[PDB]
Amino acid sequence: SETRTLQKIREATQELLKYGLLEEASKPNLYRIVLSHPEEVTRILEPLDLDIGIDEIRGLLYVKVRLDETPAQDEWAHPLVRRQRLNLEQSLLVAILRQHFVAWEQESGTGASQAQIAIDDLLPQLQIYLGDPGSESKERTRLLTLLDQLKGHGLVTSPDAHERIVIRPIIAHLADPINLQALLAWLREQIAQQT
Template sequence: MTGIFDRITAAEKPHHVAPEEVDAQAEGSPGPQPQVSHARDEEWRTPRKVREAVQEMLKYGLLEESQKPNLYRAALADTEAVERILEPLDLAMGIDDVRGLLFVMVRQAGQGEDDDWSHPLVRRQRLNLEQSLLIAVLRQHFIVYEQESGTGANLAQVAVDELIPQLQVYLGELGSEAGERNRVLALLDQLKGHGLVSAVDAHDRVVIRPIITHLANPENLQALVAWLRAQVQGTGAANTGEAGEQA
């Protein structure tokens, strides 16, 4: 006869589980959930080519058909997807299909909002007077080239020596040919960083990029002219004041 202590001891011993019982329990347990496959993950994503096109535009500010034809076509074929990506960033895509050009635009600020230069993705580097004047001169060369070769032609070139006398009209002479040349080369190098011109080639020429037609549009050029007039008037007023004090 089994005593009370024998029954208590037997109850506290670990129950031996047979191997077949372990297998049965393993089959019935849910176990770790399988990871979502890569194929299913891609179902809801924006197409890869469209993502790459937007990344290229955000990196350089523009996308040229002549430079990246596949990405250009991908963005143009799915403009709604591109706009969905850019809209939360307060950006939009400008389209110049005649010149084969897509470019990033800052959406117009609403009433009470800051201006475009406050946008966190826009470089806070305003063009100075010398750069703006050179852009205006280059745009004139580009327009003449398009009038002769047709809108959409993208090999507008200008020699460095052609730009020197045109800038002298506005900026005056430095008194040194080497100084004049270095000034133009330095300005061209700065504009190259904005994607407006190519590097100077072996024949001392640069290619003017089509984006210049949008950066130096009539509205911006009118603003530049108004600013120059204000500067001239301010200088004239200052000179008049100095003359009055001397008198």
């Protein structure tokens, strides 16, 4: 009877709200459609105070709070977007992944296909800040659960059949990347001072 939003756009919007992002790498049909109808998606999200920011270089779309332009409130608060503070280990892992991603981009260029990194490569680096919990069976399990937790936020893919992961584009758009650098360097200096 009455007009209904195009099925593909509805699917794209629901997906974008569910997962928080789209990528041309793994969802081309929806990603291209969204870019071909930006005014429709932005109109659909505006009533909820949500709005898509698009990163054409890396082929990514991600939701972000559309609240007022620097109102009397110096920090935004949104009913639906529940804020989180990653625990210490998650913060360290995110910092390591972020610096790996930036270092790779420095060479291959912005938006270059990320090189697959093996699980074995990260444990020595987490050891630099967490020591040895007691066994390989423990540290590897911890690293795997941490990677699975991060995949929920969309920062990393699942370990493939050969135990290598790929860093997702969304890592570049974290809220305050300066925090990762500061904490990581501070803990590194702590261990270097205690040793």
